[PDB]
Design a protein around this nucleic acid. Structure first.
Ligand SMILES: [Zn+2]
Ligand SMILES: [Zn+2]
Lengths: 114, 91, 147, 120, 69
RNA sequence: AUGCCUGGGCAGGGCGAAGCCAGAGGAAACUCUGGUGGAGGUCCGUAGCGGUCCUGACGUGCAAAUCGGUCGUCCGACCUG
RNA sequence: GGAGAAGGGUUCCAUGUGAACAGCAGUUGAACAUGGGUCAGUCGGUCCUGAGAGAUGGGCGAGCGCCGUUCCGAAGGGACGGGCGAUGGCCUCCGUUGCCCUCGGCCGAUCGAAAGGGAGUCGGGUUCAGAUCCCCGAAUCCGGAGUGGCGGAGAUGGGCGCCGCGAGGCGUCCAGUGCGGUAACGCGACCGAUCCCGGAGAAGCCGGCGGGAGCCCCGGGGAGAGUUCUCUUUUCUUUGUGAAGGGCAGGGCGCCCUGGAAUGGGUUCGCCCCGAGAGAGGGGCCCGUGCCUUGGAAAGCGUCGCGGUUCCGGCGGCGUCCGGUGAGCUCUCGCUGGCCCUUGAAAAUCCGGGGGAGAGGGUGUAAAUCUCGCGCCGGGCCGUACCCAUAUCCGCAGCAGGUCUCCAAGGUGAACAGCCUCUGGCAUGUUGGAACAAUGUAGGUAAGGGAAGUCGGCAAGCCGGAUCCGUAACUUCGGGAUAAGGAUUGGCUCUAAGGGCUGGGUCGGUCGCGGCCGGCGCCUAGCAGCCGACUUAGAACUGGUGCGGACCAGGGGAAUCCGACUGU
């Protein structure tokens, strides 16, 4: 059985020193240092536990190399907020504006009566 | 009483800490670990996240309540008194 | 949850009416305060739980928390875990009020300073016995080397 | 030598009381045995339900009984399912016969009422 | 490296100014043409043998088409 | 010696608490039986940590405090850079 | 055994010597004398901040200095747009600086981690000694790109009036910062500022389950091989593919659409979910470290044979294959839970979103491309050898002491226990020979008694694993408890039980054994075939009553005093 050593000078098994096994054309198992697992952006609402879809879960400095379409989705608040909370915001804004209009009309009617 | 007679949750402590202390603890230990009914969704999802803070699994609503109970009798009394004073003041 | 503090804190977002910005504040959460709740602060604020208003406006017998011992110190009195101060009587002349503190002392305070309506969230914390050296060790490790 | 010893073990040998140093749970975990049995029984129940062998309510009742470990293996569960199916078939046959008799009686009474109304 | 599905695309890639030695490897029904560029080594796999023989004569400028053996 | 920050580590087994499932009894309150569950500043025990006894060995020693057997603990008031 | 961190600093390699050291010796050495050796955009420092340290302002102090890091500060010398002035370069066009107008929160200069965060290199070959660094082959990250080096997106639409049989051409009005899907969302791009919001960075411990990989196992094919006095289709070694892209398995979703469910249903090892939309269908997204493909068989390895006195990094034939498995060990990913009077880090940096301040050419072109595919240039400075420990570190030394980590084969076995073996390592640890006296140190054995020895059962000894029975006093009802006390344990030959995958749509008609349609059987008590990991119980036979046969491996009971306990 082929026992293998670290290929760098960081002997301590830390977060930055994580490795995986890989077989080479030389027919010997070696260590490959794997990158950290990136996470997709979370919704700006702060209420939905799930993370946003349609965007690659990669490191922020790799987001710079990623293209624009991979970093968002074609929608209002796309890639920053979930569709459920987006439509909730839309309907809430519409309803609050309608209620404000109704209150303004009632206040004008009260002023006219008085 | 299927397995334990009069310990239940405090059976993990074993013979240690004293019978009276374990009996006194039992109420708080059950209350803080019991899931309450969220009065926003109606589901039994209110779980004590930490000291004095409870979280709803479904509503994702976080409520600042008691340390071991969702609502304390002192909180209920002060809420009722504040409501009464508000009504008296506003008329 | 604030380490080393029994009472939980609440982050509240206001909008500063001078610049296009959203201010954030760390209030002491009164019992019953929940997320997605509107809190109103000021002389004209309504008398509801989770609303900081001057003690002069509120009527007698009002239970408050995070009381300001002096006008403008942002709240110092009755803010530990579940403690509360009681507004006993108001004196319109000289702009002074009487407050019963959780220790039982009756203090004369200014009517200008504000207070948050309701008791502090997290009462009954001391009822549960510690039951261990370890629980006390973990409690004091987050506060200071005094256990 | 190890291959021959393993073949002897497979035939059943060197596994007596005097060659067992660990407890029964250590040698074969009861939790894993329960996992295997539950998975087998639930797979059988789901296969029957999807093959239309049992109805939804009977499937749910058998699932609850399996969780309560009424059945110690797959054969006894299969036999219990067969007994339940035979009982259901007998009860359905009797109910259908009674319903047919009642429908015939009601139809005859309705025809008699129609005849009486026509006669006036 | 990048694999090319079209012989016309392979010819366009090989016709680049920065293009260089294009080697031919006869792999016993898996014959390939590998053209080296500045960034990628573009490979084209031809199943047919007569088609590869015909493509051998399609090099415009007299490149380094020397085969691999 | 202690406080803080940032990292690493701790085989295999016994006891089987909350919670849940099924069966039986009851008029109810609910109670018994068989399972699932793996909690514990829980027990045996390895690595690790420490040093009870033989007042063993040595005692101008391997060593200005070491070695052998037997030892306490080993999921938390744990050990450590 | 193979590699590191701190520490040492030439101890690393080759040659030569045996003056001195290696408590004997030495042709030997880490000794001595000569010469050689550390090759980086990708491995780390360098950057950021944590606990913390420490200037300016201010205060104190006889004074060296101290207090303090936002506190008794006129604390940003920065930026877009506009205006003025000037030089420079085909003063066309651009850049530069000077002034003016304008805009602007930050939060303390600075230091602080070779284990925290931190973009991006892998495979083969190679030296006496260095090689993710050198050679070859494949990549990738950042910065620059004025004139912009190319293609491609903003892109070449409609209307009206004419000519032309027709395709088509001319004149004029225009729109044109993209498109598709109900939806989740997708397509190679797809203008955009001051400003604002958000995300990643960025998170505890423990348990369970599932996916993937490395290793181990078994049934075979090959190649090389030990035994063959008898048997053994024999036992032993090998039997592969990188980073970076494309596609597909395989996982997860608290994502969407049709629909509305009690006769409650779905579902896990456990949980859990549902009229705030469950089952059932159709879709969508993330990781895809795994399989196929470019890389890539050219190279590597196992064999057979040659060229070459010698140098020679050579030349060639073949193989590098087909399957199943497991609470199996390790690593990683993903769900799910339990615990906290513990809630389990900051900053550098990057990205997304709300807005349209502003730009564009006007009908063939342009401003822009958070740049879509290519093409060009550069990446500076420091460490890179070795030891990393019964001889390269610290203990006065080649000292039985101490010193932070990674890799973890087979058998027995619960086991990372002890014992034996494979890869790898070594000469038994500052010396050898000859006898086996007394004292000793470390192991054992002893007829009969069994603590009568001794201050004291000091020491030794007894029991010890597993399976099946049984288990008292007391009690805080949790325990005591493996209480106490009993039986079995080997070998060989059998029996029973605990499972997966596939298969009937058979008859007729029709089309090319395969496909479609119709009524049939609808196994709805399931049968037939094929595979596979271990167990549990029982039965007989048998060995000189021996069987947890080595190893591992609890002595119990009745009480008193003290301390609750765990811990120190
Ligand atoms: Zn949301
Ligand atoms: Zn709720």
């Amino acid at each position: 059985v082929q026992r293998l050593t670290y290929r760098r000078r960081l002997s301590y098994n830390t977060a930055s020193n994580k490795t995986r096994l890989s077989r080479t054309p030389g027919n010997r198992i070696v260590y490959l240092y794997t990158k950290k697992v990136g996470k997709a952006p979370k919704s700006a609402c702060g209420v939905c536990p799930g993370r946003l879809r349609g965007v690659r879960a990669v490191r922020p400095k790799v987001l710079m190399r990623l293209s624009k379409t991979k970093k968002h989705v074609s929608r209002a608040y796309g890639g920053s907020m979930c569709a459920k909370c987006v439509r909730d915001r839309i309907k809430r804004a519409f309803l609050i504006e309608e209620q404000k209009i109704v209150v303004k009309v009632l206040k004008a009617q009260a002023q006219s009566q008085k | 009483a299927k397995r334990t007679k009069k310990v239940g949750i405090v059976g993990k402590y074993g013979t240690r800490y004293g019978a009276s202390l374990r009996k006194m603890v039992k109420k708080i230990e059950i209350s803080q670990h019991a899931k309450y009914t969220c009065s926003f969704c109606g589901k039994t999802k209110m779980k004590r996240r930490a000291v004095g803070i409870w979280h709803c699994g479904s509503c994702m609503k976080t409520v600042a309540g008691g340390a071991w109970t969702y609502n304390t009798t002192s909180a209920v009394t002060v809420k009722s008194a504040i409501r009464r004073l508000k009504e008296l003041k506003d008329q | 949850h604030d380490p080393g503090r029994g009472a939980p804190l609440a982050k509240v977002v206001f909008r500063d009416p001078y610049r296009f910005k959203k201010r954030t504040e760390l209030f002491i959460a009164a019992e019953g305060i929940h997320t997605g709740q509107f809190v109103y602060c000021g002389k004209k604020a309504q008398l509801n739980i989770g609303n900081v208003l001057p003690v002069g406006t509120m009527p007698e017998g009002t239970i408050v928390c995070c009381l300001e011992e002096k006008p403008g110190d942002r709240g110092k009195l009755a803010r530990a875990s579940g403690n509360y101060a009681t507004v006993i009587s108001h004196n319109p002349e000289t702009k002074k009020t009487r407050v019963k503190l959780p220790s039982g002392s009756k203090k004369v305070i200014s009517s200008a300073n504000r207070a948050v309506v309701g008791v502090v969230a997290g009462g009954g914390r001391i009822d549960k016995p510690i039951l261990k050296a370890g629980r006390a060790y973990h409690k004091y490790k987050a506060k200071r080397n005094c256990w | 030598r190890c291959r021959k010893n393993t073949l002897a073990r497979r035939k059943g040998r060197h596994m007596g009381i005097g060659k067992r140093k660990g407890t029964a749970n250590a040698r074969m975990p009861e939790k894993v045995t329960w996992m295997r049995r539950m998975r087998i029984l639930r797979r059988l129940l789901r296969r029957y339900r999807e093959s239309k062998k049992i109805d939804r309510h009977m499937y749910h009742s058998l699932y609850l009984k399996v969780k309560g470990n009424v059945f110690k293996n797959k054969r006894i569960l299969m036999e219990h399912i067969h007994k339940l199916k035979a009982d259901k078939a007998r009860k359905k046959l009797l109910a259908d016969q009674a319903e047919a008799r009642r429908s015939k009686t009601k139809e005859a009474r309705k025809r008699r009422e129609e005849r009486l109304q026509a006669k006036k | 490296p990048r694999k090319i599905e079209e012989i016309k695309d392979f010819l366009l890639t090989a016709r680049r100014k920065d293009a260089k030695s294009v080697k031919i490897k006869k792999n016993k029904d898996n014959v390939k043409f590998k053209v080296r560029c500045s960034r990628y080594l573009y490979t084209l796999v031809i199943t047919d043998k007569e088609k590869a023989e015909k493509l051998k004569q399609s090099l415009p400028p007299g490149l380094a088409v020397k085969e691999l053996k």
